Design a binder for this molecule. Sequence first.
Ligand SMILES: C=C(CC(=O)O)C(=O)O
Length: 305
Amino acid sequence: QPIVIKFSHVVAENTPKGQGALLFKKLVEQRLGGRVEVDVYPNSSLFGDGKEMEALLLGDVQMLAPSLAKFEQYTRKVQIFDLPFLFDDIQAVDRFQRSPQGRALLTSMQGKGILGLAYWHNGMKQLSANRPLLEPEDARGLKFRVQASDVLNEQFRQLRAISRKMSFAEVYQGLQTGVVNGTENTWSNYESQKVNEVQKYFTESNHGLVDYMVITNAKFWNGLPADIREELQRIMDEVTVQVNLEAERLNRDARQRILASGASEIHTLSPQQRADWRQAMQPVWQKFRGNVGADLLQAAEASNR
Ligand SMILES: C=C(CC(=O)O)C(=O)O
């Protein structure tokens, strides 16, 4: 009789998405009277990148919240969120997500059996490496780990660097062993996974973002009793507010803990240095302009107002 919802993810528990998954479980327990139960599998403990979606389509899991950079095998529209320097900050991405177009992207993969339920924020991305990254030319010849995204692969190729798509669980070992010597991520991801132990230099570039689309199997979700589906959506909407609030503070704490370690430095780009990094990376947009389309790019650019 109880409907079971298995929510798998790849991040540590002490994170926006980690706390969000646990909060969803808690609120379902406190409000659904045992009619729904939620199991949460963090840190790739059940499924890591890629495999998670294969499992979602098979029904081995009922809920995921993957980075918006990881949907190119289902749609090419969500690639917009990966374009470097498109969004000035999370407030901008939030505006885009709220737009009619941003809301419609939650159904962009419905024909493949994937239903989006919400956007969760994590934060802006920074750059890391074993050498200082002050000017774009510093990235040349480095090997950067990226999420499984052609946009992100091309971003570093544009900087004359090598890109290596790797699952999130593999980043630490990849950097520790030299398979990669740098990467990009939020302060939360870096500190939660202790990647600062293997990256001496960080650059607060805010050159992109890590945000998530909470997703489910359309067949499973659309097959739930209406009253339960609606209540679960209402809970999810409350959980979204909480995740979005904790994301900001968790990212600030993570930065402080990295700076306090003494084993890693952080360089903050001047507005002009940032413009130069933007100038060097923005050419990549031309490669995806066709996939995303002029309207989405217009809406995203308008979100910076
Ligand atoms: C974005 C991530 C992980 C995530 O926060 O879900 C990554 O870099 O693979």
